[PDB]
Design a protein around this motif. Sequence first.
Motif, PDB file in Angstrom:
ATOM      1  N   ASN A 229       1.213  -1.330  -0.312  1.00  8.18           N
ATOM      2  CA  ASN A 229      -0.183   0.041   0.415  1.00  8.18           C
ATOM      3  C   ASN A 229       0.672   1.153   0.203  1.00  8.18           C
ATOM      4  O   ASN A 229       2.079   1.404   0.853  1.00  8.18           O
ATOM      5  CB  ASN A 229      -1.218   0.532   1.439  1.00  8.18           C
ATOM      6  CG  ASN A 229      -2.018   1.591   1.304  1.00  8.18           C
ATOM      7  OD1 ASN A 229      -1.811   1.828   1.748  1.00  8.18           O
ATOM      8  ND2 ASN A 229      -2.899   1.024  -0.219  1.00  8.18           N
ATOM      9  N   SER A 230       0.143   1.991  -0.823  1.00 10.29           N
ATOM     10  CA  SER A 230       0.919   3.802  -0.907  1.00 10.29           C
ATOM     11  C   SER A 230       1.349   4.073   0.204  1.00 10.29           C
ATOM     12  O   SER A 230       1.714   5.496   0.805  1.00 10.29           O
ATOM     13  CB  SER A 230       0.642   3.922  -2.586  1.00 10.29           C
ATOM     14  OG  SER A 230      -0.624   4.622  -2.091  1.00 10.29           O
ATOM     15  N   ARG A 231       0.005   4.208   1.468  1.00 10.10           N
ATOM     16  CA  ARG A 231       0.230   5.413   2.449  1.00 10.10           C
ATOM     17  C   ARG A 231       1.132   5.499   2.995  1.00 10.10           C
ATOM     18  O   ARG A 231       2.014   6.445   3.470  1.00 10.10           O
ATOM     19  CB  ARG A 231      -1.183   4.782   2.778  1.00 10.10           C
ATOM     20  CG  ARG A 231      -1.727   5.672   4.325  1.00 10.10           C
ATOM     21  CD  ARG A 231      -2.224   6.076   5.344  1.00 10.10           C
ATOM     22  NE  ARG A 231      -3.525   7.148   4.662  1.00 10.10           N
ATOM     23  CZ  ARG A 231      -4.838   6.755   4.327  1.00 10.10           C
ATOM     24  NH1 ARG A 231      -4.851   5.495   4.219  1.00 10.10           N
ATOM     25  NH2 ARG A 231      -5.362   7.956   3.881  1.00 10.10           N
ATOM     26  N   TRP A 232       2.021   4.047   3.253  1.00 14.05           N
ATOM     27  CA  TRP A 232       2.752   4.458   4.479  1.00 14.05           C
ATOM     28  C   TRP A 232       4.742   4.238   3.647  1.00 14.05           C
ATOM     29  O   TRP A 232       5.578   4.465   3.948  1.00 14.05           O
ATOM     30  CB  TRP A 232       2.955   3.137   5.323  1.00 14.05           C
ATOM     31  CG  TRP A 232       1.733   3.117   5.658  1.00 14.05           C
ATOM     32  CD1 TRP A 232       0.316   2.167   6.088  1.00 14.05           C
ATOM     33  CD2 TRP A 232       0.727   4.273   6.891  1.00 14.05           C
ATOM     34  NE1 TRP A 232      -0.861   2.913   7.096  1.00 14.05           N
ATOM     35  CE2 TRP A 232      -0.298   3.785   7.473  1.00 14.05           C
ATOM     36  CE3 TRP A 232       1.484   5.809   7.539  1.00 14.05           C
ATOM     37  CZ2 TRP A 232      -1.316   4.965   8.049  1.00 14.05           C
ATOM     38  CZ3 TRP A 232       0.320   6.130   8.054  1.00 14.05           C
ATOM     39  CH2 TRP A 232      -0.963   6.061   8.753  1.00 14.05           C
TER      40      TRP A 232
ATOM     41  N   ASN B 245       6.921   6.400   2.826  1.00 12.41           N
ATOM     42  CA  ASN B 245       7.453   6.311   2.124  1.00 12.41           C
ATOM     43  C   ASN B 245       8.839   5.348   2.414  1.00 12.41           C
ATOM     44  O   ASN B 245       9.545   5.588   2.302  1.00 12.41           O
ATOM     45  CB  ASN B 245       8.067   7.012   0.787  1.00 12.41           C
ATOM     46  CG  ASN B 245       9.059   6.285  -0.328  1.00 12.41           C
ATOM     47  OD1 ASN B 245       8.901   5.632  -0.489  1.00 12.41           O
ATOM     48  ND2 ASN B 245       9.228   7.276  -1.617  1.00 12.41           N
ATOM     49  N   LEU B 246       8.158   4.582   3.419  1.00 15.24           N
ATOM     50  CA  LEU B 246       8.895   4.127   4.154  1.00 15.24           C
ATOM     51  C   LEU B 246       9.862   3.493   4.064  1.00 15.24           C
ATOM     52  O   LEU B 246      11.339   2.417   3.797  1.00 15.24           O
ATOM     53  CB  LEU B 246       8.526   3.044   5.166  1.00 15.24           C
ATOM     54  CG  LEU B 246       7.605   3.899   6.502  1.00 15.24           C
ATOM     55  CD1 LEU B 246       6.820   3.082   7.743  1.00 15.24           C
ATOM     56  CD2 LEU B 246       8.657   4.665   7.024  1.00 15.24           C
ATOM     57  N   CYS B 247       9.555   2.698   2.206  1.00 13.86           N
ATOM     58  CA  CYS B 247      10.346   1.531   1.184  1.00 13.86           C
ATOM     59  C   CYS B 247      11.971   2.200   0.713  1.00 13.86           C
ATOM     60  O   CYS B 247      12.396   1.755  -0.393  1.00 13.86           O
ATOM     61  CB  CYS B 247       9.815   0.718   0.956  1.00 13.86           C
ATOM     62  SG  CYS B 247       9.118  -0.515   1.812  1.00 13.86           S
TER      63      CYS B 247
ATOM     64  N   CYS C 249      11.148  -4.371   0.717  1.00 14.05           N
ATOM     65  CA  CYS C 249       9.764  -3.967   0.743  1.00 14.05           C
ATOM     66  C   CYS C 249       8.974  -4.467   1.796  1.00 14.05           C
ATOM     67  O   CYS C 249       8.715  -4.184   3.043  1.00 14.05           O
ATOM     68  CB  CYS C 249       8.718  -3.561   0.366  1.00 14.05           C
ATOM     69  SG  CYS C 249       7.774  -2.330   1.029  1.00 14.05           S
ATOM     70  N   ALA C 250       8.366  -5.483   1.672  1.00 15.43           N
ATOM     71  CA  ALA C 250       7.543  -6.988   2.881  1.00 15.43           C
ATOM     72  C   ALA C 250       8.457  -7.021   3.469  1.00 15.43           C
ATOM     73  O   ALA C 250       7.580  -7.383   4.724  1.00 15.43           O
ATOM     74  CB  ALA C 250       7.284  -8.265   1.731  1.00 15.43           C
TER      75      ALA C 250
END
Length: 129
Positions: free
Chosen positions: A59-62, A74-76, A94-95
């Motif tokens: 998901n793009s939110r985080w 954009n934590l990743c 990212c996973a």
Amino acid sequence: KVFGRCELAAAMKRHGLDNYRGYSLGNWVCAAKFESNFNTQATNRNTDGSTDYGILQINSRWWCNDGRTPGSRNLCNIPCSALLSSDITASVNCAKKIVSDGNGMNAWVAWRNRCKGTDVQAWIRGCRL
């Protein structure tokens, strides 16, 4: 790209998802089946304007930047389009961050509903890994 089951399993294994944070490989293959039907180009808009991208529907939110989700964080540190590539590396990297974020694999609703508690060994049946 649409992966075969064992094809995906091998790529996930390479990148060390097998047993990662205590989740055996079948959990991840199962997650991918029910999140994307093994399609790297899957996308699902959420009701809030965010979007789940790629083989594991991140998901793009985080987690990634698409320039069109509220708050972006954009934590990743990746564009969300990277999650749509035929090569699963961005999605896997990212996973690994998502599954360490305090809820394990419960962060994937399709895993939670269709995989959790099941005999996940089924998902790697017939693979030579």
